[PDB]
Amino acid sequence: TRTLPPGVSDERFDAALQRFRDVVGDKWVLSTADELEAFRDPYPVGAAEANLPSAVVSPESTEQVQDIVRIANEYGIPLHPVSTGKNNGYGGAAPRLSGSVIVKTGERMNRILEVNEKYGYALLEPGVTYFDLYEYLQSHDSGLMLDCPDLGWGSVVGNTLDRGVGYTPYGDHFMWQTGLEVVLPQGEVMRTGMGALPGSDAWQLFPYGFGPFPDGMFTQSNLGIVTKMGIALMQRPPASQSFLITFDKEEDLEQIVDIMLPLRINMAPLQNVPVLRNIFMDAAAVSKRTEWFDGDGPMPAEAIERMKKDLDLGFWNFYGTLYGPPPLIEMYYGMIKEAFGKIPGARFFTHEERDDRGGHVLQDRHKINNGIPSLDELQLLDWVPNGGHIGFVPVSAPDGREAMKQFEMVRNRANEYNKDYMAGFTIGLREMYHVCLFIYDTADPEAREEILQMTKVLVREAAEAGYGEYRTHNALMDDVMATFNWGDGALLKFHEKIKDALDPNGIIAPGKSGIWPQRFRGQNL
Amino acid sequence: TRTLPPGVSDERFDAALQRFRDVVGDKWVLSTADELEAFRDPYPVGAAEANLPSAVVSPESTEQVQDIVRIANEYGIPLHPVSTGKNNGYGGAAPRLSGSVIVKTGERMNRILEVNEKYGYALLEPGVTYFDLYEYLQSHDSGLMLDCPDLGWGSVVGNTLDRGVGYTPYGDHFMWQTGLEVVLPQGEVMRTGMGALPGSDAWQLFPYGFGPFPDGMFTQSNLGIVTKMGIALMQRPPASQSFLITFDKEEDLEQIVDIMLPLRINMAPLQNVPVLRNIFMDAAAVSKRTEWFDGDGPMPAEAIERMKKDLDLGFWNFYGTLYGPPPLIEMYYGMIKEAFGKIPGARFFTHEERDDRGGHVLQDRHKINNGIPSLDELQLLDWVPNGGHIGFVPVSAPDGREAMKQFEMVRNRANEYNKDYMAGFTIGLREMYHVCLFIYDTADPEAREEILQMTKVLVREAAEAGYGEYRTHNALMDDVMATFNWGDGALLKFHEKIKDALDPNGIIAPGKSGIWPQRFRGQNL
Ligand SMILES: Cc1cc2nc3c(=O)[nH]c(=O)nc-3n(C[C@H](O)[C@H](O)[C@H](O)COP(=O)(O)OP(=O)(O)OC[C@H]3O[C@@H](n4cnc5c(N)ncnc54)[C@H](O)[C@@H]3O)c2cc1C
Ligand SMILES: Cc1cc2nc3c(=O)[nH]c(=O)nc-3n(C[C@H](O)[C@H](O)[C@H](O)COP(=O)(O)OP(=O)(O)OC[C@H]3O[C@@H](n4cnc5c(N)ncnc54)[C@H](O)[C@@H]3O)c2cc1C
Ligand SMILES: [Cl-]
């Protein structure tokens, strides 16, 4: 049965589609069931269908975005803006609110507007992928490098707008975002920062501009459709070296984290984002689950030991990258070896010392940590048939006992649903993330429903222990925002007031981050 | 004549005052003419009286702040929140809107709530000064250091809330701010970030939390009264060394800036915030104008040469600090000397080589750059009798030709209004600030009016050249916000919509950053 926007008749929707076609062109509006299939969540959560788009509209310009927004206000049609729509693990391109129209800005708004070599920045449209930007930098013999997530096919802009992250020293994307242009919910256009000062050359140089600083309000947000965004770019160092440290025991996590923090907090000797990945995560990158175990339930201890031995990895595997002149790299690596070498059974390998199957993750991290985009990690999804994942990422203090508590409680819950504990821990400077990926058969309704029910429990149990998530899937946005309820839900009430003021017709991505406009509030959508 | 809130009778104001006394106590509400004199702008701008407070209220707790806000809503009383009220150069404690009540949060809300050594942060109430925090750190044998502005008597919180800055690697205060608690304009209380997740230990560890990131909306803002704020604190390095480079010629600025940028953008070898100060600024720090010139009009070339020779300084004076093990300091200093030494006439001095009168600024920067608070810079105000200053700080690209343009155009206008050109240039990573302090006799109505009219022209001329200011004085807030008018004033319209939604009764600091609530908009206040 045809997916329609809430409250919009078939006939009114057909009329609205024609209005959208008049703006963007006939071939740039998709609305048949088969056309829309590719815009459904590739990794669906829950057995029942959810997050169904009614159409996709691909504008070519900011003006076209403004016109689309105006039409949507006239008809009361919700709009879900994306850049490349590769938010896989958190819903893909699919809207939180079923019946919403996807506004795929990146399809045609895909220009690199400027890369400035001297000051080190890019000004981008949403369709510029990490692969696209890398190709530009390489072909122009740039001295700059980008910072990419694990998969290079996403958007420099879209990733930033969900507060996505990478692993170089510029890994905090939002931090390095500098200036944006946004179409607000009734169709008006605004530039932030020094972009608001006509003729300023400092849009990509100074983020704040004058007065209240608004750019963060457009991240994980439903307050507009971003059409341009700037980001700072780091100079490529003269040399780099990546390394792996394998740690043999599950319980080593406590000591690893307690050493990681002091080596990272001053940004040296751990100069990049430290990542600690468990054996399940590293095995999934290079092998299928059935290589190790084809039975029912959690993987047994004997099979875990076989993964470690066959791949020459530990239960916990630390990956890092060093940058600078060779003598600096040598000094930092010496410090790292001295510190982590206090853990019995730790073994060290550089990216030059591992050409085996087990070393494939090290080789991938060496690319990612050097701003070389990759799709190697798509192999994770071959862990089981029809593989998909959902991301579950609580934030906590960088403390070894806190890490052990999280490890144990998530693994306990995963075991109940016969899901592997595939996880790592990362630190920024002062904060810790528990990066959990649950991989499952997307073709199995039971597995889809298990994932939904399990992750709802994980969210609750984490919150009960004082951990909240930094980012989440469509299916969990209400649940996660409900955990941030200090002062009787004060934060959400604040967001709601702002949403209603900027979006009185309730058009833009209703329900993103649990923030619903008045007309949808309290309706179990 | 008694200063009253706009539209509020003597009798209604008296009733509101009594309600405030019922909340905070009789001695914590000030409302006599004599009491209020001390809360006037110490460095008034314009001949006519302006920015007059009607009262000062000193709450002891968040709950008291909430009750004050509720009372202000009921009686229509505008509230200007401050921490320590030392925003000298930009209005002091005085409200933009005459007749507003100052809410001096810092008088009694002055506790250090937490200093965490391991993760490196503080959680603070508004009344904690830089001197207060330094005394705490020293007395507890901390391994942390703070980042202070030039004068240590301000508030760690209040400074951050105006996007104030210091000069260590943690010089961007707002960047390192992590979590806040705020009373919104109708009296509800909210915590940002992980503070919104009850029981989280990560309020001061991870700034963003979940969903749209709002903390920037409370800086240079009138959207609430902040009651608590967290900030990250850097670990103190094992050693440090400060240095001065004197450059003899006015025209050397171009080359200095063009060398500064590449030495700073990678955060090495220039590890701290680079500052370049002119001879007027450095002379004023150590001497009176009449030492050099007692005549009418701009200082002649012969007197400028005498300042340089007697103080053994250049026209432009570069100050920097290096941190780390002695070998690292030596290497970086070598790189800096090699690079800047290409400018003919450059001379180098370390903080160990130069404890003469001219070197007093070097010794002060060595304190500031090491998180040691100081009030030595108050000596600037002795340049002339009854000395005050106004801050004028345009932002531009870190380009030598741009610097020369700004130098010349600001100096031209200063000369025309008989004001000394006291200025420096600083760079962040990618952006440049032209830090102008105009010192004048605050007791002279003509001088006050000249300052106002000159700075209005400077704001306009800067905007015409594509430069906007990062921060400004009460008297210039409307003018500066008017320059950020891309898209027919889109930015201000956005701010106004948010202001009216959160503050329907138009209570909090009307006119801050040029943002007026509906009831005051378009009224020439
Ligand atoms: C195995 C695996 C590994 C992963 N590793 C990482 C990783 O290392 N780091 C990481 O960050 N992610 C990671 N992800 C998640 C995901 O792949 C990336 O974050 C990806 O870059 C996001 O998709 P995108 O860039 O296409 O953004 P989009 O899907 O285009 O945008 C994401 C969201 O941002 C908002 N948005 C985007 N564009 C606009 C706009 N123009 N206007 C307004 N709002 C907009 C919307 O809410 C949208 O849903 C991983 C996923 C998988 C499956
Ligand atoms: C010679 C000289 C040198 C200076 N050098 C520097 C320098 O190096 N760096 C720099 O940043 N400044 C500098 N200043 C400016 C000024 O001294 C400082 O920034 C000072 O720290 C600001 O005053 P404060 O900390 O008392 O903040 P306050 O005056 O208390 O607050 C400043 C503003 O922030 C807001 N605010 C404060 N508290 C709250 C609250 N609780 N809730 C809501 N809003 C609030 C208000 O708008 C308020 O007016 C200099 C000034 C002079 C005269
Ligand atoms: Cl409120």
mmCIF file of C-alpha atoms in Angstrom, chain B residues 57-165:
data_model
loop_
_atom_site.group_PDB
_atom_site.id
_atom_site.type_symbol
_atom_site.label_atom_id
_atom_site.label_comp_id
_atom_site.label_asym_id
_atom_site.label_seq_id
_atom_site.Cartn_x
_atom_site.Cartn_y
_atom_site.Cartn_z
ATOM 1 C CA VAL B 57 20.650 41.609 43.187
ATOM 2 C CA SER B 58 23.122 39.035 44.564
ATOM 3 C CA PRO B 59 21.616 35.494 44.722
ATOM 4 C CA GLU B 60 23.162 32.659 46.748
ATOM 5 C CA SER B 61 21.855 29.660 44.774
ATOM 6 C CA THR B 62 20.336 28.379 41.539
ATOM 7 C CA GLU B 63 16.920 28.297 43.213
ATOM 8 C CA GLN B 64 17.282 31.981 44.135
ATOM 9 C CA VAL B 65 18.206 32.786 40.518
ATOM 10 C CA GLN B 66 15.054 30.954 39.393
ATOM 11 C CA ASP B 67 12.914 32.956 41.822
ATOM 12 C CA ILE B 68 14.499 36.276 40.718
ATOM 13 C CA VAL B 69 13.734 35.413 37.093
ATOM 14 C CA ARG B 70 10.114 34.517 37.995
ATOM 15 C CA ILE B 71 9.688 37.858 39.796
ATOM 16 C CA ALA B 72 11.195 39.755 36.866
ATOM 17 C CA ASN B 73 8.667 38.090 34.526
ATOM 18 C CA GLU B 74 5.765 39.030 36.806
ATOM 19 C CA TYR B 75 6.808 42.715 37.118
ATOM 20 C CA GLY B 76 8.354 43.173 33.627
ATOM 21 C CA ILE B 77 11.824 43.974 35.007
ATOM 22 C CA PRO B 78 14.823 43.488 32.639
ATOM 23 C CA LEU B 79 17.735 41.545 34.142
ATOM 24 C CA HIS B 80 21.392 41.823 33.151
ATOM 25 C CA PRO B 81 23.265 38.747 34.461
ATOM 26 C CA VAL B 82 26.964 39.022 35.230
ATOM 27 C CA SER B 83 29.480 36.851 37.035
ATOM 28 C CA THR B 84 32.085 39.297 38.412
ATOM 29 C CA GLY B 85 31.076 42.232 36.187
ATOM 30 C CA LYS B 86 34.651 43.114 35.117
ATOM 31 C CA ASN B 87 33.888 43.275 31.358
ATOM 32 C CA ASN B 88 35.908 46.475 31.182
ATOM 33 C CA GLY B 89 36.379 47.726 27.626
ATOM 34 C CA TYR B 90 32.932 46.369 26.689
ATOM 35 C CA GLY B 91 30.722 48.011 29.343
ATOM 36 C CA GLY B 92 31.939 46.711 32.720
ATOM 37 C CA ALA B 93 28.945 45.451 34.715
ATOM 38 C CA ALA B 94 26.606 47.989 33.147
ATOM 39 C CA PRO B 95 23.504 46.783 31.224
ATOM 40 C CA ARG B 96 22.979 47.511 27.543
ATOM 41 C CA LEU B 97 19.421 48.587 28.415
ATOM 42 C CA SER B 98 19.254 51.451 30.921
ATOM 43 C CA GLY B 99 17.025 50.667 33.879
ATOM 44 C CA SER B 100 17.896 46.955 33.952
ATOM 45 C CA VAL B 101 18.644 45.203 37.239
ATOM 46 C CA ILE B 102 22.086 43.601 37.427
ATOM 47 C CA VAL B 103 22.006 40.032 38.705
ATOM 48 C CA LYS B 104 25.474 39.646 40.185
ATOM 49 C CA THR B 105 25.677 35.852 40.357
ATOM 50 C CA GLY B 106 29.342 35.839 41.384
ATOM 51 C CA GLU B 107 29.067 37.783 44.642
ATOM 52 C CA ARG B 108 27.711 34.770 46.555
ATOM 53 C CA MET B 109 27.772 31.973 43.941
ATOM 54 C CA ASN B 110 31.535 31.723 44.133
ATOM 55 C CA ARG B 111 32.366 28.076 44.922
ATOM 56 C CA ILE B 112 34.839 25.824 43.206
ATOM 57 C CA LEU B 113 32.563 22.765 42.990
ATOM 58 C CA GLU B 114 35.152 20.272 41.684
ATOM 59 C CA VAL B 115 38.709 20.178 40.431
ATOM 60 C CA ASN B 116 39.508 16.776 38.920
ATOM 61 C CA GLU B 117 43.276 16.131 38.696
ATOM 62 C CA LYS B 118 43.109 12.877 36.732
ATOM 63 C CA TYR B 119 40.799 13.994 33.904
ATOM 64 C CA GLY B 120 41.847 17.678 34.100
ATOM 65 C CA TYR B 121 38.794 19.851 34.634
ATOM 66 C CA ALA B 122 37.007 22.221 36.978
ATOM 67 C CA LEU B 123 33.315 22.683 37.694
ATOM 68 C CA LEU B 124 32.749 26.288 38.791
ATOM 69 C CA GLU B 125 30.195 28.794 39.961
ATOM 70 C CA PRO B 126 30.370 32.274 38.360
ATOM 71 C CA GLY B 127 32.150 34.028 41.247
ATOM 72 C CA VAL B 128 35.377 32.010 40.932
ATOM 73 C CA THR B 129 38.037 34.422 39.635
ATOM 74 C CA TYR B 130 41.242 33.409 37.879
ATOM 75 C CA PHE B 131 43.088 34.397 41.055
ATOM 76 C CA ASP B 132 40.715 32.190 43.088
ATOM 77 C CA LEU B 133 41.242 29.149 40.852
ATOM 78 C CA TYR B 134 45.017 29.681 40.750
ATOM 79 C CA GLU B 135 45.122 29.885 44.574
ATOM 80 C CA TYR B 136 43.169 26.605 44.732
ATOM 81 C CA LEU B 137 45.501 24.889 42.241
ATOM 82 C CA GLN B 138 48.635 26.099 44.033
ATOM 83 C CA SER B 139 47.411 25.283 47.542
ATOM 84 C CA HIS B 140 46.398 21.730 46.493
ATOM 85 C CA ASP B 141 49.725 21.099 44.678
ATOM 86 C CA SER B 142 47.881 20.587 41.386
ATOM 87 C CA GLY B 143 49.611 19.401 38.224
ATOM 88 C CA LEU B 144 47.075 21.457 36.209
ATOM 89 C CA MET B 145 47.240 25.033 34.978
ATOM 90 C CA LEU B 146 44.540 27.503 34.045
ATOM 91 C CA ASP B 147 44.291 29.743 30.984
ATOM 92 C CA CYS B 148 43.738 33.385 31.930
ATOM 93 C CA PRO B 149 43.097 36.650 30.114
ATOM 94 C CA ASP B 150 45.477 39.559 30.723
ATOM 95 C CA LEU B 151 43.728 40.549 33.985
ATOM 96 C CA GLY B 152 43.178 37.882 36.645
ATOM 97 C CA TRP B 153 40.292 39.533 38.511
ATOM 98 C CA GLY B 154 37.613 38.381 36.086
ATOM 99 C CA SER B 155 35.522 35.228 36.186
ATOM 100 C CA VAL B 156 36.471 31.914 34.609
ATOM 101 C CA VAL B 157 32.762 31.587 33.764
ATOM 102 C CA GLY B 158 31.843 35.183 32.875
ATOM 103 C CA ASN B 159 34.863 35.539 30.580
ATOM 104 C CA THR B 160 33.923 32.327 28.749
ATOM 105 C CA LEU B 161 30.335 33.520 28.399
ATOM 106 C CA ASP B 162 31.520 36.538 26.363
ATOM 107 C CA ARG B 163 33.855 34.231 24.362
ATOM 108 C CA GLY B 164 36.879 35.701 26.098
ATOM 109 C CA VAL B 165 40.359 34.376 25.416
#
